[PDB]
Ligand binder design. Structure first.
Ligand SMILES: *[C@@H]1O[C@H](CO)[C@@H](O[C@@H]2O[C@H](CO)[C@@H](O[C@@H]3O[C@H](CO)[C@@H](O)[C@H](O)[C@@H]3O)[C@H](O)[C@H]2NC(C)=O)[C@H](O)[C@H]1NC(C)=O
Ligand SMILES: *[C@@H]1O[C@H](CO)[C@@H](O[C@@H]2O[C@H](CO)[C@@H](O[C@@H]3O[C@H](CO)[C@@H](O)[C@H](O)[C@@H]3O)[C@H](O)[C@H]2NC(C)=O)[C@H](O)[C@H]1NC(C)=O
Ligand SMILES: *[C@@H]1O[C@H](CO)[C@@H](O[C@@H]2O[C@H](CO)[C@@H](O)[C@H](O)[C@H]2NC(C)=O)[C@H](O)[C@H]1NC(C)=O
Ligand SMILES: *[C@@H]1O[C@H](CO)[C@@H](O[C@@H]2O[C@H](CO)[C@@H](O)[C@H](O)[C@H]2NC(C)=O)[C@H](O)[C@H]1NC(C)=O
Ligand SMILES: *[C@@H]1O[C@H](CO)[C@@H](O[C@@H]2O[C@H](CO)[C@@H](O)[C@H](O)[C@H]2NC(C)=O)[C@H](O)[C@H]1NC(C)=O
Ligand SMILES: *[C@@H]1O[C@H](CO)[C@@H](O[C@@H]2O[C@H](CO)[C@@H](O)[C@H](O)[C@H]2NC(C)=O)[C@H](O)[C@H]1NC(C)=O
Ligand SMILES: *[C@@H]1O[C@H](CO)[C@@H](O[C@@H]2O[C@H](CO)[C@@H](O)[C@H](O)[C@H]2NC(C)=O)[C@H](O)[C@H]1NC(C)=O
Ligand SMILES: *[C@@H]1O[C@H](CO)[C@@H](O[C@@H]2O[C@H](CO)[C@@H](O)[C@H](O)[C@H]2NC(C)=O)[C@H](O)[C@H]1NC(C)=O
Ligand SMILES: *[C@@H]1O[C@H](CO)[C@@H](O[C@@H]2O[C@H](CO)[C@@H](O)[C@H](O)[C@H]2NC(C)=O)[C@H](O)[C@H]1NC(C)=O
Ligand SMILES: *[C@@H]1O[C@H](CO)[C@@H](O[C@@H]2O[C@H](CO)[C@@H](O)[C@H](O)[C@H]2NC(C)=O)[C@H](O)[C@H]1NC(C)=O
Ligand SMILES: *[C@@H]1O[C@H](CO)[C@@H](O[C@@H]2O[C@H](CO)[C@@H](O)[C@H](O)[C@H]2NC(C)=O)[C@H](O)[C@H]1NC(C)=O
Ligand SMILES: *[C@@H]1O[C@H](CO)[C@@H](O)[C@H](O)[C@H]1NC(C)=O
Ligand SMILES: *[C@@H]1O[C@H](CO)[C@@H](O)[C@H](O)[C@H]1NC(C)=O
Ligand SMILES: *[C@@H]1O[C@H](CO)[C@@H](O)[C@H](O)[C@H]1NC(C)=O
Lengths: 730, 754
């Protein structure tokens, strides 16, 4: 028997073994900013030598705690975020202090206002664009009076320059609607109108001191509810006048998008006077990307119907979540974007503003994960082609002049330790930092694009290795199970000292979200590590119909059929795992979060009998309750004419009776902005009405993530007890 | 054994078997949780409505029947088929005093404990037809017949309307009606759940000439906000806002009014004279405790200041010339309590004599025990007509020759209740009316007299099966038995029902009573797991002689768990000394005694020390949480259902009455030293199950949420369960069954039961 310690839940809850990382900020095509011992340091990318940029002492007397720093492209001033207060996933409010780096002084005039919602440095220069009270303001110079752009900003009504809840969590996936022109002359902002959007009302219990609970209302368009109205405007920052209100040029949306509900999915600056706006109709199966240019005579941005590019998908939704960002060339008369080929595998395609033909430069059964950098000679991109593994990531470069000349830059660096390579290029793609998150310890290495040569290893996580060498860390097994001749991959965190002769319990961690991957090669220290190392449980995950990075066919398989194919596949995988031999048929469990929790609820209510017990955290019960953008993209409109029937059938409440055959633990946070507590409330009510005896746990004032240190520890501690009790483990 | 003995061995085997049988041969069924949830064994009841001095109405086979008490015969007042063609299920019926009309309630909707809304249809008994004209409006909040005659006054949209004749149009009285702002004729949440303890602020005059109404103002009262999930169809949850004055928050404004119904005309509006509170009450926030009509021209109002330790009763007489009711300062009776709060829960209702120049009322004596006091309207002297170490539970009847009251004097048992009558002319002449009726089966008695108290139904609650008997006051003669629960008795013979023991332990030379539901086949030698059911509310009695078939019965009969309840400092019907002991110190002495109670029970000899638990609701949940957080170590686990945490969260009227004001100058220290959240660290040593209904209106979910958050912060692993869209009662059939099912599971797991 090994005397090494197991990875205990304490190690997971109280991060003991930490995975070191090297995060740097490229400031130029030869230098980056890496913070060490509270000191920003400038490391010459090629030489490797380090020069102190800002000593801790500089901000030791700041009097506040700088949550995050921001360096101007010119580096003449630095933004300091203090009084940080987080709202939703990306939305946050904090105070900003602009510290001059030339006279080494803190600007004390016309300072950024308190509770600023978003501030951004100019692309090139030291200009700023802070958003305050749902309003956009532009400061030509950090020490100059601010110039106000918008004037109609209203809280929870008119969002100017900042995305609303739905857009922040689904569309732009950020809290920034400000887009500066490449040189900083033009600022492009978006006005989101939520006047009609209905409000979700949940109660916040604040602290013990609070006497009456605060009721919080958020503009949240539930499936079928009126979506927010989006308008796009462009303002000339250089022409900003303190005497007169700045004039904003509102660019109209594509005519096709003006016949119904429209969504501005992405805004990309092509040139100094060319901008590309990608829009998508209410039904997410029709997208038009406009390439509007800027006229000088009328000083009015104009859209050309000839340049418009229309992408429609009958198989399913257009774009995994939204049309990808087009990486335009320097001239701006040609752009490269990831599109799905007729076969159904998304690949890179070369387009020209005048041309209307897609010239795909990549082809195969693999799929282009993303474009990294475009530099005349080669276009760099990450793909899952290596070893035909959908759960692998590798950097590739393709000569633009000769597309046939494609070169992998990471596939043969360290095959055993690194297979999920990810990269961040420099300002001019001269030096790129390649990092691998699996299957071995995270490794961070710099490179030189000129000769594809490894400059040096920034981080090797060696300190974690020796420590891990003293722990029975559970092994990870990633393979595939052929189902209906459709290869589906699965991963298994086999317990340490695994022996297929013996029989082990199996917990199927599940998510099965549209376009999701739970069978990657990433190395992670999570609760699964504890369950496998200490509780000796085979934690496993499966990617069936609905899995992403495997082609449109599999991804669009659950189109207009949510909680159907994916649920059956997960149960099928459990059967496949059970007959593999090592899995104990009697002790099989499933646990999931959000969509995973919805799947967990569905599989427990399936009545298959394969699963014995299950835990669902903040699970979606009725798709009608969920937001419109997500549900509509994978279900449609909840209207009798459209897919209303599927919405009604796909409700956890329907399978309530079957739950009597299994143990269900329903955990949900009272203050859940995303999956509202309403979902779990209806689940509990249904189970209570039918009489299903189930355990539950509400976390007061906890978000969808339930990440608050205390709640995080308690939720996993309680979950540990449930799994151990159900699996009859000591 | 295994010797020469062969058939003799089989013979000894036989003997052994016989012996075993003598020790154990039980084959009866046990009272299972199924029996409790599905009410397999139901207790019958005979609740009659005395409609006259000689006749009453009782419902048999859905048929309203009139019964002559003296003769004992009966006649069909209304056939069940009579309303089969109504088209709606009549929830309840109200017969006009004249017996010429009846109100049919349909579309019944419930709000809080008493508040409700329903549609009413008047039925002409004389013409055997339903009144179709001027029908009572839908959603009417309250409707009441005049004391005599057939006048109808109802509250609709927070406005009081009066119908002189059922067939005639309604005459609107108040026009200031508004929702959650101005409540006219109806009581706001605070008063409904605390002061008046009802949803009726209307008071008909004795002959119906006047109508007394109250205008509650909640414009400043802060609103509690809880979300309602309704049904699956509802897409966006509805946030419900209820006027709830938390401890220290702005309390509602109360104004009293009286209107001459006889002068009501459709030509103009009807003016209402306002009876202002006495200056003493006006100095600060005041509460109209109760309104009692004395004579046709005399009314009595009880007002109590926010600090509940100073109350004044205003006897107000109407002046014909002025047309305005006036109050003589001398007639006012002031009641102040330095030791604690005035009244058990509020100033008691006075019983005025027919003449109206004298009245009897329940006042605590100098010793500290509440007793009847004869009060003359023109005197300030309180002459106590009764006295002793007992207490007058309540007055039920006031005949010109005798006063009838229920007391706990019999056998000096604070729980026992018996009917006593006292000669008005000779207070020394007091005769018990039920003490020696059936002491073996009945020790807890309640009574309902007729219009002239000629006949009275003495209903019994235990310790035996509920027994309902009618008696004649003329010579204290028992007319007959109405309900004997004989059928229930026969069925109960089959099951091994658990027994009940009510005794008292001596703490600091003071007698504190306790009750134990001993399991069937109880053996003092054997030790049983003990669950301390507890409420320990101020002026509350958990130990009594009432027969009840509840969850505890299943716990004792099937799980063989002794269920015990103890009444310590703060118990009711035991004297002011014990009741006012926790004054301005809630969650202190009461918690310690319950802990001490378990300690005494453990050393009794039949309680397993390793397996002792506790459960409670509301204040009981607060005590359950406190004893678990007391770090005593006496209890192993506990279940808290809708428990109160920080006392500031609870309503002001209740908390302020005992704890006081949550202000730095007052008891704010204890307000922040009696929070359950404070003892979170100690909870780690015990097990905990926090259950609370999401839409609870009394104990708000916020209180439970704070407890849960605190436990998570400290690191206590506790099970929990939120019942969605459930009130404090959580009595919805589904929830009721589910809550006890889950609770049973936890108890068995904690007590390691097989
Ligand atoms: C965000 O969207 C809402 C809803 O479309 C906009 O509200 C609209 O505001 C205009 C202002 O002129 C209203 O027009 C006028 O409304 C009045 C009645 O309020 C009517 O009498 C006039 O004939 C005229 O229609 C419009 O009705 C109103 N729509 C509503 C309330 O549904 C709001 O202005 C938008 N905000 C921005 C900054 O775009
Ligand atoms: C229930 O209580 C509220 C709060 O006391 C009452 O509202 C109050 O009504 C009086 C009416 O005279 C208001 O006084 C007047 O206010 C106006 C300005 O609003 C001022 O111009 C007049 O000179 C006079 O002072 C008082 O301000 C107002 N208080 C508020 C709104 O907070 C309400 O009338 C009560 N309802 C009933 C039926 O008793
Ligand atoms: C690393 O060392 C090189 C020299 O080997 C530095 O390059 C010189 O930096 C000085 C800074 O004042 C310049 O004046 C020289 O012109 C640079 N020489 C060349 C050839 O570029 C480099 O700056 C050092 N990097 C850091 C971060 O200290
Ligand atoms: C820029 O726009 C703002 C907002 O419309 C103007 O501020 C308003 O000015 C008028 C002048 O009569 C006031 O009545 C309003 O109350 C002001 N605020 C709002 C919210 O309307 C401002 O004057 C404009 N500046 C210029 C130069 O036109
Ligand atoms: C940044 O880019 C913008 C867009 O091209 C420039 O704006 C135009 O620049 C051209 C060339 O200087 C002028 O002829 C136009 O009149 C400009 N238009 C406007 C509306 O100003 C801008 O000059 C560029 N800025 C810099 C510093 O190069
Ligand atoms: C986008 O999806 C909608 C909804 O499915 C499509 O509208 C339907 O189209 C089908 C034919 O393909 C008709 O039979 C339906 O009646 C249409 N409406 C509904 C309510 O389903 C729409 O055609 C799709 N657009 C594209 C470009 O494929
Ligand atoms: C209305 O009352 C009559 C009178 O009792 C009920 O009829 C009785 O029904 C029971 C059960 O079927 C029989 O045992 C009795 O013999 C019936 N009595 C007579 C005289 O018919 C009748 O069921 C009641 N109806 C409703 C709607 O409750
Ligand atoms: C019980 O029986 C008595 C008679 O023994 C009833 O009393 C009489 O009832 C008749 C009915 O027509 C009346 O005319 C008499 O005036 C009654 N006499 C008295 C003294 O009241 C009595 O009504 C019966 N009770 C019931 C409920 O049926
Ligand atoms: C009784 O009082 C009500 C309320 O004041 C009167 O109804 C109002 O009459 C005024 C007359 O100007 C109207 O402006 C209001 O709209 C009426 N309604 C309300 C709710 O205020 C009613 O007329 C009075 N009746 C008589 C006969 O005096
Ligand atoms: C109900 O009681 C009221 C109050 O005593 C009676 O009203 C008085 O009746 C007497 C005798 O008729 C008159 O002298 C008074 O002037 C009345 N007072 C008022 C305010 O009207 C009323 O008459 C009684 N009703 C009945 C039917 O007895
Ligand atoms: C009712 O209770 C209040 C609050 O306890 C009493 O007010 C206190 O009175 C005492 C003297 O009796 C003072 O020492 C305190 O300072 C007062 N205030 C507080 C905050 O305790 C009031 O006297 C009581 N009234 C009666 C009639 O007993
Ligand atoms: C501040 O920077 C200096 C640089 O030499 C380093 O030695 C010191 O430890 C730093 N202090 C903190 C608190 O990081
Ligand atoms: C923000 O508020 C704090 C507290 O009042 C103040 O000290 C600080 O100077 C404010 N900052 C600005 C930029 O107004
Ligand atoms: C109550 O509602 C019913 C059904 O709409 C209607 O027939 C009836 O007249 C209403 N009653 C009154 C008095 O409003």
């Amino acid at each position: 028997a090994d005397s090494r310690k197991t990875y205990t839940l304490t190690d997971y809850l109280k991060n003991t073994y930490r995975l070191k990382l090297y995060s740097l900020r490229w400031i130029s095509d030869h230098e980056y900013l890496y913070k060490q011992e509270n000191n920003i340091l400038v490391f010459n990318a090629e030489y490797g030598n380090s020069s102190v940029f800002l000593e801790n002492s500089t901000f030791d007397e700041f009097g506040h705690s700088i949550n995050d720093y921001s360096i101007s492209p010119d580096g003449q001033f630095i933004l300091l975020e203090y009084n940080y207060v987080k709202q939703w996933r990306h939305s946050y409010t904090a105070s900003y202090d602009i510290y001059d780096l030339n006279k080494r002084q803190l600007i004390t005039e016309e300072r950024i206002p308190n509770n600023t919602q978003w501030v951004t440095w100019s692309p090139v220069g030291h200009k700023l664009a802070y958003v305050w009270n749902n309003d956009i303001y532009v400061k030509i110079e950090p020490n100059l009076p601010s110039y106000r752009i918008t004037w109609t900003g209203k809280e929870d009504i008119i969002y100017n320059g900042i995305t609303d809840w739905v857009y922040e969590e689904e569309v732009f996936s950020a809290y920034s609607a400000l887009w500066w022109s490449p040189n900083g002359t033009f600022l492009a902002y978006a006005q989101f109108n939520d006047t009609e959007v209905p409000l979700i009302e949940y109660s916040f219990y604040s602290d013990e001191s609070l006497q009456y609970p605060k009721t919080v209302r958020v503009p949240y368009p539930k499936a079928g509810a009126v979506n927010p109205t989006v308008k796009f405007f462009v303002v000339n920052t250089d022409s900003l006048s303190s005497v007169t209100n700045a004039t904003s040029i509102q660019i109209t949306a594509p005519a096709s998008m003006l016949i119904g509900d429209h969504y501005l999915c992405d805004v990309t600056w092509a040139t100094q006077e060319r901008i590309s706006l990608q829009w998508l109709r209410r039904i997410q199966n029709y997208s038009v990307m406009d390439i509007c240019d800027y006229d000088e005579s009328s000083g009015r941005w104009n859209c050309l119907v000839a340049r418009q590019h229309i992408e429609m998908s009958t198989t399913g939704w257009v774009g995994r979540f939204r049309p990808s960002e087009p990486h335009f060339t320097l001239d701006g008369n040609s752009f490269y974007k990831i599109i799905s080929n007729e076969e159904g595998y998304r690949h890179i395609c070369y387009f020209q503003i005048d041309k209307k033909d897609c010239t795909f430069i990549t082809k195969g059964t693999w799929e282009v994960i993303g474009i990294e950098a475009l530099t005349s000679d080669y276009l760099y991109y990450i793909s899952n082609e290596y070893k035909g593994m959908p759960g692998g990531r590798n950097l590739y470069k393709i000569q633009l002049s000769d597309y046939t000349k494609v070169t992998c830059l990471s596939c043969e660096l360290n095959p055993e330790r690194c297979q999920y390579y990810s990269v961040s290029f420099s300002k001019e793609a001269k030096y790129y930092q390649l990092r691998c998150s699996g299957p071995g310890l995270p490794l961070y290495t710099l490179h030189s694009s000129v000769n594809d040569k490894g400059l040096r290893v920034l981080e090797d996580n060696s300190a974690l290795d020796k420590m891990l060498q003293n722990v029975q860390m559970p092994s990870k097994k990633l393979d595939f199970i052929i189902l209906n001749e459709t290869k589906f991959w699965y991963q298994m965190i086999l317990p340490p000292h695994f022996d297929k002769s013996k029989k082990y319990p199996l917990l199927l961690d599940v998510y099965a979200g549209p376009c999701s991957q739970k069978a990657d090669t990433v190395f992670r220290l999570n609760w699964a590590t504890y369950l496998a190392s200490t509780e000796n449980i085979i934690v496993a995950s499966f990617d069936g119909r609905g899995s992403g990075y495997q082609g449109d066919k599999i991804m669009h398989a659950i189109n207009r059929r949510l909680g159907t194919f994916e649920v059956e596949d997960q149960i099928e995988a459990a059967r496949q795992f059970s007959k593999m031999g090592f899995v104990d048929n009697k002790r099989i469990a499933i646990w999931g979060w959000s969509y995973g929790g919805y799947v967990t609820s569905m599989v427990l209510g399936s009545g298959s009998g394969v699963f014995k017990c299950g835990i669902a955290v903040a699970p979606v019960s009725r798709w009608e309750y969920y937001d419109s953008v997500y549900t509509e993209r994978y279900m449609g409109l909840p209207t009798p004419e459209d897919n209303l029937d599927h919405y009604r059938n796909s409700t956890v409440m329907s399978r309530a009776e079957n739950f009597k055959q299994v143990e269900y633990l329903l955990i949900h946070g009272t203050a859940d902005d995303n999956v509202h507590f309403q979902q779990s409330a209806q689940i509990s009510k249904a189970l209570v009405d039918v009489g299903v005896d189930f355990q539950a746990m509400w976390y007061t004032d906890e978000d969808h993530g339930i990440a608050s240190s205390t709640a995080h520890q308690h939720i996993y501690t309680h979950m540990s007890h449930f799994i151990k009790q159900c699996f009859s483990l000591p």
